[PDB]
Design a binder for these strands. Sequence first.
RNA 1: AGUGGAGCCUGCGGCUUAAUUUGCACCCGGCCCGGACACGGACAGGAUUGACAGAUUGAUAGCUCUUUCUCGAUUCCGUGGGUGGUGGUGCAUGGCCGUUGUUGGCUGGUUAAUUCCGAUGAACG
Lengths: 232, 59, 57, 121
Amino acid sequence: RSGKLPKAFKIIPALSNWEQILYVTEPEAWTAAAMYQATRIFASNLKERMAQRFYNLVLLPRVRDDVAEYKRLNFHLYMALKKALFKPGAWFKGILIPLCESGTCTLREAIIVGSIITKCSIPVLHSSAAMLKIAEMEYSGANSIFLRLLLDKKYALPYRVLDALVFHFLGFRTEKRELPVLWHQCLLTLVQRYKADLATDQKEALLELLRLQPHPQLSPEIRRELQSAVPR
Amino acid sequence: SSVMRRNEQLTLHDERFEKFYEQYSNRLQEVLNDYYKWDCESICSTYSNLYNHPQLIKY
Amino acid sequence: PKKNKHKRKKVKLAVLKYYKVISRLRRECPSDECGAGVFMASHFDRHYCGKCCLTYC
Amino acid sequence: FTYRGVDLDQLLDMSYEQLMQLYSARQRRRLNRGLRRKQHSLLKRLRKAKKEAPPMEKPEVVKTHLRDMIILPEMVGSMVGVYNGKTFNQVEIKPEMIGHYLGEFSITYKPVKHSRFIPLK
RNA sequence: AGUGGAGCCUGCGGCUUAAUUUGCACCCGGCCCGGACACGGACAGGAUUGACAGAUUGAUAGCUCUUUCUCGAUUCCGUGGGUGGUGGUGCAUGGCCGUUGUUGGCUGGUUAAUUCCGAUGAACG
Ligand SMILES: [Zn+2]
């Protein structure tokens, strides 16, 4: 509940055989504040790789089945996930992307960790890596949220990342399945932020995408933003 | 990768992604041994109304 | 009784006190991970390593 | 002063276990049932307060929430402040206070301190 | 037979109270956290993270108050009648339950005990 942690628990960042130590500590039987303190000590004084392993093994299944149980995130769990975000690279390669090819990510987890994305400034290079590794993977109802919010981060986009994203939109030519209003929201944020970085072939490419995949409400905004774009 | 590319206008940085896709004790015994009467309405009766009268002009 | 968040004392040029001119004005941490730059906090009775947290008196 | 025909000096010199018979039944049952960690904690704090005092005047005040201490002869002369729910009452432990609880000496409630029509027509 | 009288208990009012919660809800103290967007400030000369020891405290505690060691861009300060999101709430809306017969089929410790825990399928209408 509260009070000082034992000093035998604050040495695990410097301890070698961490796997059996965490296993005998029974990772499934923790409370919220103890997990928050564990993420604090494993994101403050720790290195990248075994912190990433911690993020894979313990934190991600716990937050997943907790939001399955309660349809919300606990306060200490939210603080723990923010403290996991304090180390960018381990968090991306350990929490976000593993949840991305997990395939069973729901909308609630996606919007929660996207809110966690938006609440803190991240490095541009890790964000570009996230966009590349999320554009190379298949489309669902959850990865688009990270697309939309990390385009709303409005960073200096590398152009290979732009080629990967437009290559995904090349991947959507002739599919008939009705992609939601959130798809057009992601396209709206993309053409609102990076209309000044698009070449002409990108312009007519998204134009014929608009022709092939229409939208009764937001597609006039996409036509307006494409026709009012200053070339790079 | 793709086939449609930059073609113009000043690529700044070189987009390092090679570390992302291809990524995937005496102190012990020492801490082990360390383990073991007025209000706003009544006060209005205090104010008088007979001191600073302006001088009256009669008809 | 509102809880004000702590603010770190922004000291001017914290680096510019452990050297001369050459040598180390503070001693060095003798640990395995700590050394050759991990300088030793010298408080009025006691000595501190900021990474591995050794207690030297 | 004396308590049950016993003076304070040997009362301090008496044991914990056979002081029990001198008290009343409530206190004896409490001493049967042991004392908790906070009890010896504030015992150590009042001892430290007595130790660091100059030998001419009374020691410093030690304050607590803990209302269910029985006053033991160790505590005679101490400067103890007990929370009565809102404030702290500071009291000197007299030898006459030797049986009661601390919570008796800081009351948690305040005393209660609490024109006819005549016809004119 | 009573009640209305008396003592005591209880219910509404009212009075005292920090509170005497109400048609543990109340009070006194201590923690913990608490947007982005825009614009202006500080930031590698360094933003910021973690911390032993001692203290305040009703108690301990880098969740605070001293003294410096370290992490370094993972940033933090101010102003908005501008939105808002881990918000609450209804409708249309796709999947999925339950709802309105017939015949078969033992390593271990433990107890009085084939005792206890512990490993360990089919058709017919
Ligand atoms: Zn060291």
